[PDB]
């Protein structure tokens, strides 16, 4: 019933790969990346949203700690509560904790709601990627093989289901006998496959990719 593969980048719903640097803001990149796709779907415009806005403004009230880590779910809740998030162009990324400088004059998106998917359910994750759009997830990236990944379907025997790095599932497929998740990272274009990593799919929640999925929506 579900398509064999989906790629939301091919549907024009994914912005350029970003570079987080030495600031632990992968949660903020994962969240804006999911919302960017919903924004494209609803308005026809593809616009990078401000991860720095989340770093500086979605802070202790949201359980988040800026460059020391955060949640995608509470990032979405900030955008709901704030009734907007600035464009990345107006509020660019500095890889530092800064004062909140959100300005509604440069609001580029809103968020109406978000959804959390059940733990470890790669079938439900697949359905959501097919039927909803890119999904924010955490993965276990504390392995040299992850940092050193260049191409192919990533499979790390010592991976755990305990996540520590936010990323964005923008698709999935089946290539060269291997089912995979298509994952947008925030380590710049020189990481992996032009900034992407394809991660083993249907291998018992490999690297925790389906541990904590969430996605936002923008309602009419
Ligand atoms: C043991 C596992 C714990 N765990 N770990 C994650 C999780 C998910 C994704 C990543 C990613 F790598 F992608 F970044 C990470 S990396 C660690 C992030 N970590 C760093 C230190 C500062 C707090 C951030 C962790 C999640 C959960 C539980 C459910 N999850 C949620 O999002 C839902 C919860 C969000 C937090 N509320 C609590 C309150 C929220 C507002 C008021 C203050 C607390 C409860 C529901 C996802």
From Swiss-Prot:
How is the subunit organization of this protein annotated in UniProt? Monomer.
Question: Does the keyword Signal belong to this entry?
Answer: yes
What's an example of a GO molecular-function annotation for this chain?
Answer: proteoglycan binding
Q: Give each disulfide bond as a residue pair.
A: 13-111, 23-67, 57-100, 159-207
Active-site residue list: 26, 165, 185
Q: Which residues of the full protein are shown?
A: 114 to 331 of 331
Give the source species.
Homo sapiens
Q: What is the recorded name of this protein?
A: Cathepsin S
Its main localization is: other
Instruction: State the protein's purpose.
Output: Thiol protease. Key protease responsible for the removal of the invariant chain from MHC class II molecules and MHC class II antigen presentation. The bond-specificity of this proteinase is in part similar to the specificities of cathepsin L.
E.C. numbers: 3.4.22.27
Q: Which Gene Ontology biological process is one annotated for this entry?
A: collagen catabolic process
Superkingdom in the source lineage: Eukaryota
User: Where does it live in the cell?
Assistant: Lysosome; Secreted; Cytoplasmic vesicle, Phagosome
Catalytic activities: Similar to cathepsin L, but with much less activity on Z-Phe-Arg-|-NHMec, and more activity on the Z-Val-Val-Arg-|-Xaa compound
Kindly state which keywords UniProt assigns to this record, in alphabetical order.
Cytoplasmic vesicle, Disulfide bond, Glycoprotein, Hydrolase, Lysosome, Protease, Secreted, Signal, Thiol protease, Zymogen
């Amino acid at each position: 019933i579900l398509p064999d593969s989906v790629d939301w980048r091919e549907k024009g719903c994914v912005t350029e790969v970003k570079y987080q640097g030495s600031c632990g803001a992968s949660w903020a990149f994962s969240a804006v990346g999911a919302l960017e796709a919903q924004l494209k779907l609803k308005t026809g415009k593809l616009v990078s949203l401000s991860a720095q806005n989340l770093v500086d403004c979605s802070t202790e009230k949201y359980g988040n700690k800026g460059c020391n880590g955060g949640f995608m779910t509470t990032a979405f809740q900030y955008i709901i509560d704030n009734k907007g998030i600035d464009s990345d162009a107006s509020y660019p990324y500095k890889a530092m904790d800064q004062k909140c400088q959100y300005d509604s004059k440069y609001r580029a998106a809103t968020c109406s709601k978000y959804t959390e998917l059940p733990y470890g359910r790669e079938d439900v994750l697949k359905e959501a990627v097919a039927n909803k759009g890119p999904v924010s997830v955490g993965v276990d990236a504390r392995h040299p093989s992850f940092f050193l990944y260049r191409s192919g379907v990533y499979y790390e025997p010592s991976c755990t289901q305990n996540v520590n790095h936010g990323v964005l599932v923008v698709g999935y497929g089946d290539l060269n006998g291997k089912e995979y998740w298509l994952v947008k990272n925030s380590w710049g274009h020189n990481f992996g496959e032009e900034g992407y990593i394809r991660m083993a799919r249907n291998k018992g929640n490999h690297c925790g990719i389906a541990s904590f999925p969430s996605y936002p929506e923008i309602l009419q």
